[PDB]
Amino acid sequence: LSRYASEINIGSKVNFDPIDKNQIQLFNLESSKIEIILKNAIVYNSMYENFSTSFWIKIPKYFSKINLNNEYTIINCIENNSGWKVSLNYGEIIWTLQDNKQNIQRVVFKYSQMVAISDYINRWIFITITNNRLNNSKIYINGRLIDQKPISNLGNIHASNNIMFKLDGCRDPHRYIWIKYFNLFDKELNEKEIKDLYDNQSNSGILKDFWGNYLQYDKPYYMLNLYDPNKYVDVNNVGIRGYMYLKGPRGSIVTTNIYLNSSLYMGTKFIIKKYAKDNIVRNNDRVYINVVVKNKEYRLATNASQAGVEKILSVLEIPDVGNLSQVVVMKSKMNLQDNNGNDIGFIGFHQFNNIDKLVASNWYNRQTFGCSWEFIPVDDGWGESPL
Numbered sequence: 001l002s003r004y005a006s007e008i009n010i011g012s013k014v015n016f017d018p019i020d021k022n023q024i025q026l027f028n029l030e031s032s033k034i035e036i037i038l039k040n041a042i043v044y045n046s047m048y049e050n051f052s053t054s055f056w057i058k059i060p061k062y063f064s065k066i067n068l069n070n071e072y073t074i075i076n077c078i079e080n081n082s083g084w085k086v087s088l089n090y091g092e093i094i095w096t097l098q099d100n101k102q103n104i105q106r107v108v109f110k111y112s113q114m115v116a117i118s119d120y121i122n123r124w125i126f127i128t129i130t131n132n133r134l135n136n137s138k139i140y141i142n143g144r145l146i147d148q149k150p151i152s153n154l155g156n157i158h159a160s161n162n163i164m165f166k167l168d169g170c171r172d173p174h175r176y177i178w179i180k181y182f183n184l185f186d187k188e189l190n191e192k193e194i195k196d197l198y199d200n201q202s203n204s205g206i207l208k209d210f211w212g213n214y215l216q217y218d219k220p221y222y223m224l225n226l227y228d229p230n231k232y233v234d235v236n237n238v239g240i241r242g243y244m245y246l247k248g249p250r251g252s253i254v255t256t257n258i259y260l261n262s263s264l265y266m267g268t269k270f271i272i273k274k275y276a277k278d279n280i281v282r283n284n285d286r287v288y289i290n291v292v293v294k295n296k297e298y299r300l301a302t303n304a305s306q307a308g309v310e311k312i313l314s315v316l317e318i319p320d321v322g323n324l325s326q327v328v329v330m331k332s333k334m335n336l337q338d339n340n341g342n343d344i345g346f347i348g349f350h351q352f353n354n355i356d357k358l359v360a361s362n363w364y365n366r367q368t369f370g371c372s373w374e375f376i377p378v379d380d381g382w383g384e385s386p387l
């Protein structure tokens with residue numbers, strides 16, 4: 001789907017996401033490419049006309065020293081040494097402009113791999129790049145302005161007729177990217193236009209996992225509580241006599257001079273089960289939550305007749321749930337309901353004798369709280385090994 005091109009050439013080694021066919025995976029392989037041939041009107045050739053581009057990208061973590069000092073192109077629109085391109089490097093997204101007089105200007109976005117929880121590593125991020133031929137070129141990340149450089153000294157920019165989506169110059173043989181929702185604009189977008197594009201293309205009716213992919217059923221997720229991200233979920237004991245609690249701190253995954261992050265595959269995984277025709281978790285879906293303890297699934301539930309508004313959650317055997325409250329209404333996070341269809345509360349945590357146990361409390365519904373979760377599945381772009 002491209003309203004900019006008359007011909008779309010797809011190499012034999014382009015992979016498409018089966019759950020979300022909008023997502024395109026381009027490998028560091030020579031047939032892993034998509035060339036689009038712009039319509040004659042969309043082709044850029046001017047000294048004064050402003051233009052802007054936007055796209056979503058998910059960049060896997062850089063794992064080794066073979067990734068340092070290796071700027072490689074991913075989106076190429078340069079012909080006869082003139083035009084624009086998007087390139088990548090170790091912890092960098094790079095925008096480059098070239099005129100017909102060997103003038104070059106680069107605008108760069110930088111993110112670190114030496115952070116506990118990154119917002120960019122192996123996660124979908126919205127990139128917007130805007131260009132005002134009378135002053136500056138700007139790069140936005142998730143709608144926030146990051147950096148800007150002057151381009152007014154650049155003469156005529158005759159871009160290419162084609163746009164080549166392909167990893168070019170990359171020395172990492174395992175390297176790939178995910179890309180979707182490429183767009184071109186014949187104006188300099190302002191912050192509000194970028195803000196609206198970011199929200200419009202977010203698919204707010206579908207829940208997303210930690211990496212930005214669609215939330216799915218029968219997919220094991222490691223849980224992260226956004227109020228205190230240094231904790232992970234554990235199960236004291238299975239049965240109505242045990243509870244779920246948040247214990248910390250998280251571990252570390254390290255590779256010297258490359259990355260130092262918190263480990264994400266920690267704690268008892270959650271598995272979302274269907275209750276009330278695909279494997280996509282949408283807003284207001286009523287689902288079941290299964291929790292694995294020692295490689296065995298059990299049903300998350302509680303006894304809402306317990307004292308206090310904070311209803312401590314237990315992990316019971318599925319055949320032995322009885323009439324205990326278990327239905328969860330997913331929301332884009334988890335609103336546990338009783339069998340009467342009434343809210344018991346958003347799933348969060350509450351301190352009980354120095355133990356931050358997971359509770360379902362309507363105090364959240366009344367009122368970032370302890371009910372803010374992220375679902376972290378195993379992903380090749382992260383690289384960690386599940387313990």
Ligand SMILES: CC(=O)N[C@H]1[C@H]([C@H](O)[C@H](O)CO)O[C@@](O[C@@H]2[C@@H](O)[C@H](O)O[C@H](CO)[C@@H]2O)(C(=O)O)C[C@@H]1O
Pocket residue numbers: 227309310348349350351359361363364368369370371
């Ligand atoms: C005590 C503390 O430092 N933090 C609280 C936190 C804050 O009250 C608030 O979210 C700051 O923005 O809120 C959390 O705790 C809640 C309790 O304060 C409340 O009485 O009961 C809640 C459960 O029904 C919940 O435990 C939270 O938002 O989860 C965490 C912490 O206690």
